[PDB]
Amino acid sequence: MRYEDAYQYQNIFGPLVKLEADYDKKLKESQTQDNITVRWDLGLNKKRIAYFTLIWLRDMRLMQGDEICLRYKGDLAPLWKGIGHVIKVPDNYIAIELRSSVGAPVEVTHNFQVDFVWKSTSFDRMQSALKTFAVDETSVSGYIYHKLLGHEVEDVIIKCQLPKRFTAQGLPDLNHSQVYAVKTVLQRPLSLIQGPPGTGKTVTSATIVYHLARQGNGPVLVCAPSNIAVDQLTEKIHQTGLKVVRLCAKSREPVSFLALHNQIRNMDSMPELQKLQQLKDESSADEKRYRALKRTAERELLMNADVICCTCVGAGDPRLAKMQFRSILIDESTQATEPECMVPVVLGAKQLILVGDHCQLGPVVMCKKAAKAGLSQSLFERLVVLGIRPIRLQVQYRMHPALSAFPSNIFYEGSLQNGVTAADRVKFDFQWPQPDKPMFFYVTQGQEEIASSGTSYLNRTEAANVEKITTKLLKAGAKPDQIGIITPYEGQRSYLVQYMQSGSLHTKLYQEVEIASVDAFQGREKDFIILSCVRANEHGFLNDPRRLNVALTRARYGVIIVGNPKALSKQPLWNHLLNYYKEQKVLVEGPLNNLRESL
Structure with a gap:
C-alpha cells in the first residue's frame, strides 16, 4: 500500500501497533x-x-x-x-x-x-518512531522518504564510492554475487539485499559496513530484530579492525567485551570513574557521580565509534537519541513488523540497506486482526511489492548440493549456485538409498492421535520410526548436538522427548537431539534434520511454503522427511516435493535396516 502523507503512514500503523501491544499485554499477564x-x-x-x-x-x-x-x-x-x-x-x-x-x-x-x-517499552519505542516519522521532515533523507511512502521518485545513485578491493580486512573474499551486492548497495541510498540460506548474510553485510564506515565521518548503525543476529554482525564487523560498540539495554549482569557497559567499566580516559567502578565492589552521594560519569563516558564511546550495533527495539534507547546516522544496515529485516524496523530508520537515515529473505520465515503478530490489516507485511516485503528488486546472493555454502535442488527450483526460481562440492558435504556408517543424494522420505503409516489435551496432534508410529532414524544417525553417526528433529505440532514434540528417554542409547545421549518447530530453527543450521509430519489424515506448516522452505534448507549433510503422503499430497507444495523424491527415486518405504524403493 502507498501512502500520501507521513501522517497517513502514522494514522495507519498507529492503531496497528496498539492492537498487538494490547494483545501482547494480555498473553503475558494471563499466561x-x-x-x-x-x-x-x-x-x-x-x-x-x-x-x-x-x-x-x-x-x-x-x-x-x-x-x-x-x-x-x-x-x-x-x-x-x-x-x-x-x-x-x-x-x-x-x-x-x-x-x-x-x-x-x-x-x-x-x-x-x-x-x-510485561513492559510497554518495546511498543512505546515503536510508536515514538511513527510519530517522529510524521512530525519530523529531517528524520529521513528526502529521497528514501518518497520510496518509503510509495511515491514516484526517480532512481538516483552515488558515484565514486566503490573501493579498490571489495574484500574487507580480516574477512574472507566475496563470491561473484556478493561483490555485486556490495557494488550495487554502496552506489545507491536505499537498497534491499535478499539473502537465502547459505548466502553469506554476515560476511556480505560486514563487508558493506566496513566501507560505509571508512568512506564516512560518523558512526554507522547496524540493527537486527533478533538479539542474536546483532551479536553475529558485531563479531564479523569486529574482525575488520573498526571500533564497534554493542548497545545492550537493561542487560545489567558472546560479544560481552564489545558491549558498551563493559567498555565504560574500565576506561583509561575516566580515572575517577575507574577508581569509582572499582570502589563499587563493597555510597548514595557517589552513586550520582557514577551514574553521571557513566552518561559522559558513554557519549565519548558512541560519537567516536566507527560502528554501533544494537537491536531494532534497541537503538531507540534515550542515549542514542540526539544522534544522527547516515548509513543504516538492518540484517534479517524480514522478521520485524514495519514500525519495529523503522525505529532506527527515523534517526536520519541517508543510506539504507535492508537484508532478509521475503521467501523465508516472517514476523510474528499475535493479534490476528492486525496481521490481516497489514502488520504482517515487513518493511522488506512492502518495498518489494512497490518494485525494488532485491540484490540476491546466489551461493549456498551450507547444505549438500543435492539437498538444495528442490528449495532452489520451487522457491528461488532455480537461480541458485552450489558453492560447495558434493564431496565437502556427505562426509560414515549410514547406508542411504542413493548415496549420491543424502535425502529420502521414509513413508510412515501411523495412527494420528489428537493427544495434546485438545490442542495438537500426535502420531506414535512416526515417533518410533523417527526414533530408529535418530538412533542410526547415532550408531557411529554425528554428535547429538548436530542432529535436529523438527515437527510442526507440539503434541508430537512432547511425545518424542519422552519417548526417546525406549531407544538403544542412554537417556542423556538423546537429550542433545533438539526437537522443536520450524520457528526455533530459523537462521540456525545443523548437520542433520529429521522432519516429522505427524499428521496422517487429509484434514501446522504443512500448508505454508515459507515455514516449509526453512525446514529443508537448515540441514548441512542430510535431510529425512517422515510422513503420510495420502494426506500431504493434498497441498501442491508437497505434491511437487513428493513427486520430486519419486523423480529422484528416494521416496522410500519399508524397513530401516533394508530400505526399499517403494511408492
Whole structure:
C-alpha cells in the first residue's frame, strides 16, 4: 500500500501497533506456569542466578533483557517473591534469570511459579518512531522518504564510492554475487539485499559496513530484530579492525567485551570513574557521580565509534537519541513488523540497506486482526511489492548440493549456485538409498492421535520410526548436538522427548537431539534434520511454503522427511516435493535396516 502523507503512514500503523501491544499485554499477564521446578547457582557477581526448565502459546518471544517474577508457593519454606531479569533464553527447551537481591531461598527447588512481567517499552519505542516519522521532515533523507511512502521518485545513485578491493580486512573474499551486492548497495541510498540460506548474510553485510564506515565521518548503525543476529554482525564487523560498540539495554549482569557497559567499566580516559567502578565492589552521594560519569563516558564511546550495533527495539534507547546516522544496515529485516524496523530508520537515515529473505520465515503478530490489516507485511516485503528488486546472493555454502535442488527450483526460481562440492558435504556408517543424494522420505503409516489435551496432534508410529532414524544417525553417526528433529505440532514434540528417554542409547545421549518447530530453527543450521509430519489424515506448516522452505534448507549433510503422503499430497507444495523424491527415486518405504524403493 502507498501512502500520501507521513501522517497517513502514522494514522495507519498507529492503531496497528496498539492492537498487538494490547494483545501482547494480555498473553503475558494471563499466561503463567502453575507449577515449575528451578535450580539455583551462585552467580558470577555473587548475584543469585536461577535455572528453571519449563495455553500452548509459550514462545521464544522473550528476549535477553526481559524480566520475570518468580513467586515461590512451596510447602517446605515460607512464601517468597523476587524479580529477576533474563540472561540466556535457549533454543534447546532451561531458561536463566538472575534476581536483583541476594536474599532468596535456595533450599526449596520445586513448587515454583513463574509469571512474565510485561513492559510497554518495546511498543512505546515503536510508536515514538511513527510519530517522529510524521512530525519530523529531517528524520529521513528526502529521497528514501518518497520510496518509503510509495511515491514516484526517480532512481538516483552515488558515484565514486566503490573501493579498490571489495574484500574487507580480516574477512574472507566475496563470491561473484556478493561483490555485486556490495557494488550495487554502496552506489545507491536505499537498497534491499535478499539473502537465502547459505548466502553469506554476515560476511556480505560486514563487508558493506566496513566501507560505509571508512568512506564516512560518523558512526554507522547496524540493527537486527533478533538479539542474536546483532551479536553475529558485531563479531564479523569486529574482525575488520573498526571500533564497534554493542548497545545492550537493561542487560545489567558472546560479544560481552564489545558491549558498551563493559567498555565504560574500565576506561583509561575516566580515572575517577575507574577508581569509582572499582570502589563499587563493597555510597548514595557517589552513586550520582557514577551514574553521571557513566552518561559522559558513554557519549565519548558512541560519537567516536566507527560502528554501533544494537537491536531494532534497541537503538531507540534515550542515549542514542540526539544522534544522527547516515548509513543504516538492518540484517534479517524480514522478521520485524514495519514500525519495529523503522525505529532506527527515523534517526536520519541517508543510506539504507535492508537484508532478509521475503521467501523465508516472517514476523510474528499475535493479534490476528492486525496481521490481516497489514502488520504482517515487513518493511522488506512492502518495498518489494512497490518494485525494488532485491540484490540476491546466489551461493549456498551450507547444505549438500543435492539437498538444495528442490528449495532452489520451487522457491528461488532455480537461480541458485552450489558453492560447495558434493564431496565437502556427505562426509560414515549410514547406508542411504542413493548415496549420491543424502535425502529420502521414509513413508510412515501411523495412527494420528489428537493427544495434546485438545490442542495438537500426535502420531506414535512416526515417533518410533523417527526414533530408529535418530538412533542410526547415532550408531557411529554425528554428535547429538548436530542432529535436529523438527515437527510442526507440539503434541508430537512432547511425545518424542519422552519417548526417546525406549531407544538403544542412554537417556542423556538423546537429550542433545533438539526437537522443536520450524520457528526455533530459523537462521540456525545443523548437520542433520529429521522432519516429522505427524499428521496422517487429509484434514501446522504443512500448508505454508515459507515455514516449509526453512525446514529443508537448515540441514548441512542430510535431510529425512517422515510422513503420510495420502494426506500431504493434498497441498501442491508437497505434491511437487513428493513427486520430486519419486523423480529422484528416494521416496522410500519399508524397513530401516533394508530400505526399499517403494511408492
